[PDB]
Amino acid sequence: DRPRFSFSIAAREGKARTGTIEMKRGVIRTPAFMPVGTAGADIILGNTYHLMLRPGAERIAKLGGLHSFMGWDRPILTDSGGYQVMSLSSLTKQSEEGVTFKSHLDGSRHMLSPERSIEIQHLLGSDIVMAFDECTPYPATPSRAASSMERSMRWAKRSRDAFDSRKEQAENAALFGIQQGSVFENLRQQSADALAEIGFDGYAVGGLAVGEGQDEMFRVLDFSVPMLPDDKPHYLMGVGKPDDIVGAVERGIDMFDCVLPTRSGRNGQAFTWDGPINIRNARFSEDLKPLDSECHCAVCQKWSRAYIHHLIRAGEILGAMLMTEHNIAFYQQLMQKIRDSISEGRFSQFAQDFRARYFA
């Protein structure tokens, strides 16, 4: 029987690592991409913020938990909810206790605190639970970044204690802490130290992919990822485009999530090894090639760019579904190639070849 949580590094190249997380519901191969569950992957995401508002966490628990609800019996990761509250909610009120906000769907009042976030995630039944943090806005002054990070670290301890108080959660799920500190090395160090003192099963790099751009994101990763425990997984939240993933793996990241595959799939963008393409453009109306020349997905085995272009232009849902299936599969082929290249000691060459072709 698999353990509750065990991360093992099978091979390394530079700062890059490849290995496995073993959990009760399955093995997660790393580096991992974690797609939205409502879109192969070893773990999917539940959308805590949406589920809080519709149908509510209690109701999900009444229906048997997310795994039953979604028909997915493998691992599920949930965020702690505050990022989306601050991003999407109205008339939010912040305090040391947490955040209160009004639901855009029906005006009901909702609060989120470390304790309530952990309880929501418990009711949803997720396997990887995120600590309740504050994603500091960018840019931030040093003073405000420090004050925000300090609050997040107090909330990380409250998250740890709430998770440990729930026997079923403590025995069957895992808890990740989230590093903050904006772009400032000293604050990132203080945050890493505070999280390691509390102790978590994995460590996320928070506070990035919030408008800083790739050069700055990579600069922050260069010093931030080494501050985290080496023997635990490293999750970069909100990232990203394929080139962001490759560079983040080069800097020691093991886990990724982002809206791009599905957002692109619904908006006419297909990922390929030669970069993204806008399938609605007339230049694809007579292109008999598959979406990508090397892709093994079922869409690329059967249908042309011309036909997918036609479906999307005609407003047919089949078109968006085919685009999304291809994009999901592309991302998982990217991660497989990353894992294999690290395991084979040729990831540096892979990254160079990837960039030369993706940006040609």
Next chain:
Amino acid sequence: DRPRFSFSIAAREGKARTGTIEMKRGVIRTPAFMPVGTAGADIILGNTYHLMLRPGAERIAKLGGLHSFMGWDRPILTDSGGYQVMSLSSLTKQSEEGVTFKSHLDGSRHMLSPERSIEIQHLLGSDIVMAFDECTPYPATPSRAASSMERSMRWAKRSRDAFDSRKEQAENAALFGIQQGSVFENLRQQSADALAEIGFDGYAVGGLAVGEGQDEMFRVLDFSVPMLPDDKPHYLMGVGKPDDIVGAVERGIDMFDCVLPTRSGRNGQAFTWDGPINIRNARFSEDLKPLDSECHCAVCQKWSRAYIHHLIRAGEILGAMLMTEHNIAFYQQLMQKIRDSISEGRFSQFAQDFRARYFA
């Protein structure tokens, strides 16, 4: 090797029949439902009117024909295009030659005539080609219904001659004639006689499902279907709801098409043996049963009403795709049950049981 076209009736009960159409690209089991190709089925529909306008029939032929374009190597049926021209186009101009109209997409002028309709269908590469007819509006006076039907019969002969002039089409495709005459028995008889004198591979009942309602449609079918050759397939165009299909089979119809499965699937309606349900309604938010209790489709094997409700309410494309997959599968299970019940001599009981449950 299969023939170009051969219809064989394997069993009968009342006016109902079950059997097979053999064509070069496949066998079609009848009674048959023929889904839109852009949505198992033995034949799918190509949308002649849309394809004429985007990308155009010549361009489809350049891309290899519909079968290649759509990735479907089995039979395809296309309509002749006028129904949609009169239904959707602007500033149409009608004459004995055909109809001219302006494309809503780009203002280009297009004409349709019997000869051009057959040529378009040739370029698309369909296997079952419909004669170019005029679907008389409902209601129609006897005089106007007669004048319209007479023009359609002249156009049926022109369609026959155009089809026969194209060797590849004549040798590999089939041509159906379309009966008109509105709701008038004498005109339906004149139309049937004219079509049989020309000679077609199959016969459609046109001019129905245009606002007359089920009682009147069935009344017209009661006298109209027996007028067609018994030994050829009978196609009721534009029909319909499950209860319309059952009653039309009871009246001698062998083939059906309609927008309902896909339109419903995109608009939150799921077909079930207990009637249609509106999955977005709050009454399904905690319903753990599948869409239908007896359905064998992959959606009903895996997911609940509650989850499909959730996806559709969240605006997720996955929800509409699951609804459509279920609805397509429901329609094909309906047709299989129809075929088996006729073959087993229990279709009368099936129809009675179907109606008692569907309308409970």
